[PDB]
Each structure stands twice: as structure tokens, then as C-alpha cells.
Protein: flavodoxin
Organism: Desulfovibrio vulgaris
Amino acid sequence: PKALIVYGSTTGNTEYTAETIARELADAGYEVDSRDAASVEAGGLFEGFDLVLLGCSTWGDDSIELQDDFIPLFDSLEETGAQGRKVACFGCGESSYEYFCGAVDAIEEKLKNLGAEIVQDGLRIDGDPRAARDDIVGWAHDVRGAI
Ligand SMILES: Cc1cc2nc3c(=O)[nH]c(=O)nc-3n(C[C@H](O)[C@H](O)[C@H](O)COP(=O)(O)O)c2cc1C
């Protein structure tokens, strides 16, 4: 199968998470395309992929804002080919904020509304992802066994 992983990441934590997932899928025999959100165009982005994984960190002062490179993709998610696509979401944040990984909820909700098939509940990482590597790999295992 072919998997696409798209991530928005400003300090590297969601990027590190995306690459650890990519390695686990690649070792399972997938062909994986891992792209930063800053370099992609929404139109038709998911065409051809068996599985799409979207990851983003959460920002904003008092509100929920998505990571800046991911905003344009989020705003044009209806042109990506998400209807009927198997997807799953992930993201890093910090539990001291009101909306812990609130970008993950906003993306899952928009996908569900477009008719995507959410394969597993979102992976939500608190603090340093390097200290939660076991959770990331476990989650990557679960999504692969699901689709
Ligand atoms: C100003 C600011 C607002 C933040 N807002 C949230 C938030 O609303 N919820 C959350 O879970 N984390 C929030 N964070 C934490 C970042 O998401 C966290 O540092 C994360 O690891 C960044 O991941 P990234 O390196 O992939 O961009 C915020 C951090 C800053 C500095």
C-alpha cells in the first residue's frame, strides 16, 4: 500500500513524530511519502493513496490555532480527495493549555464532515515526543492493523 504523511511543525516535535510513524509503516512494507505541509498544494493531494496521515501542532493565545504551514491545507481540505479515504490524525501539544492538541480535534472533525474514514482515534502527544516513542510506534502499529 501507499501512505501519505503530511505534517505542520514549527519546533520539530510533530515532524519527529511523523518520521517515526513513517519508519514503522515503511518497515511494514508500505511505500511512504512524508511531506511538510509548507511544500504541498491541496488540490488532489490524496489521490492515489491508500492511507493518509495528517499531523499538526496547536498554537494560539487563548484560542485554538493550527500550525501556520498547515492552515492553507486545512482551509482547502474539501479539494484533497478525502471522501471515502482512510485517514488518521496526530499532533503534539502541551496539557497545560486549555485545548490540549486542539488542532487534532479540528482536523478530525473537518475530515468526518467530508466523509473520510477515520481509522483510529488521533494520537495526541504531550511534551517531548522523544519521551513517548513507544506510544508513537504502538499507534502506528494499530493504524496499520486497522486498514
Ligand atoms: C503560544 C503557544 C500556544 C500554544 N497553544 C497550545 C494549545 O492551545 N494546545 C496545546 O496542546 N499546545 C499548545 N502549545 C504547545 C505547542 O503545541 C507544543 O510546543 C508543540 O510540541 C509544538 O509542536 P511542533 O514543534 O511540531 O510545532 C502552544 C505553545 C505556544 C508557545
The longest strand covers residues 86-93.
